[PDB]
């Protein structure tokens, strides 16, 4: 598909909140960015599911 | 507490001679060397960029400062070259390093050239700038003989403050390159 949809989930609470798109061929590895998690209340790293 | 011999010569006698023999209005109309540029384009980088490493090594050995790597600003299909690849390396000499390189050149490299018949006085471009090329690099004594694998030439250019061609020709003759007589 070239452009699969992916879901980002927090680490401690483990809740799926954000959804984006990425190119697997260009980025075989998983994504690792920092986003705002409402329930946690602080910016924490989010790892692609 | 040190000063290069060529710089001493220029600031002691060359400037006075030029001023006397051209009759300038003020003190600082006498031309002076600004910078020296050394570069070379290989053209084979499109197939093998390994030779670029040897080119950089040779340039560092001859000069003593890390040179550049230059890309291409256009893509030519007939020359089978596209954007982004490296093509050649350059380096600029100023001040004490420039004087030392010029002195070493005139003292060693030029006399050591095989079949050296002089330099054409027609190499100027009108405004007082000299440029010429070389075919073989091992003439320089700083690069050892057996460590080189392939022959690579280079082009070196000198720029002065001379207003016209005659001023620069006189200044560089006073410096004393082996000019040809015509």
């Amino acid at each position: 598909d070239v452009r699969p949809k992916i879901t980002l989930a927090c680490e401690v609470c483990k809740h799926r909140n954000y959804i984006t798109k990425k190119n697997r061929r260009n980025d075989p590895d998983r994504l690792e960015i920092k986003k705002f998690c409402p329930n946690c209340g602080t910016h924490q790293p989010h790892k692609e599911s | 507490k040190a000063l290069p011999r060529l710089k001493q010569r220029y600031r002691e006698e060359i400037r006075e001679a030029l001023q006397q023999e051209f009759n300038y209005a003020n003190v600082m109309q006498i031309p002076g060397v600004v910078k020296v540029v050394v570069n070379m384009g290989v053209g084979d980088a499109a197939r093998d960029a390994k030779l670029i490493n040897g080119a950089i090594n040779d340039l560092a050995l001859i000069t003593g400062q890390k040179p550049e790597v230059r890309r291409a600003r256009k893509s030519i299909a007939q020359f089978k070259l596209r954007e982004g690849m490296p093509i050649g390396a350059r380096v600029t000499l100023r001040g004490d390093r420039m004087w030392e390189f010029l002195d070493r050149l005139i003292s060693i490299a030029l006399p050591r050239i095989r079949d050296f018949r002089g330099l054409s006085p027609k190499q100027f471009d009108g405004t007082g700038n000299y440029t010429f090329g070389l075919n073989e690099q091992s003439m320089f004594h700083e690069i050892d003989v057996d460590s080189i694998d392939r022959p690579r030439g280079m082009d070196i250019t000198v720029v002065t403050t001379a207003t016209n061609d005659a001023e620069g020709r006189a200044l560089l003759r006073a410096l004393g390159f082996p000019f040809k007589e015509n």
Binding site: - | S138, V145, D146, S147, I148
Partner: protein, 116 residues
Amino acid sequence: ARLVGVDLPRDKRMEIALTYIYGIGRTRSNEILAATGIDKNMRTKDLTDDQVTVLRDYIEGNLKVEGDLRREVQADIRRKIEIGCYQGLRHRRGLPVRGQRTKTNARTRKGPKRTI
């Protein structure tokens, strides 16, 4: 060992180790070893640096080796091919210069064989 950018063989008699140098061959090696008095049968395991260095000194003082040799060879080739000499034209055509029997032999100069 190593000399003038030439990797001396791990274990070879000096009479051929010096031969491996492009500027020195069999009889030149024989004469050089006779002059230096060095035995021509010993192995590389007993080689020592000082004798090698003095040998390098003698050979560089008395002869021209490797890149210089190449350079005058191609200088000769280019001058002969530019002056229009018979050897120059033969080099242009990639054929023997002495004028041997090109009829069947000279495959060494003509390179591989291609059929028509």
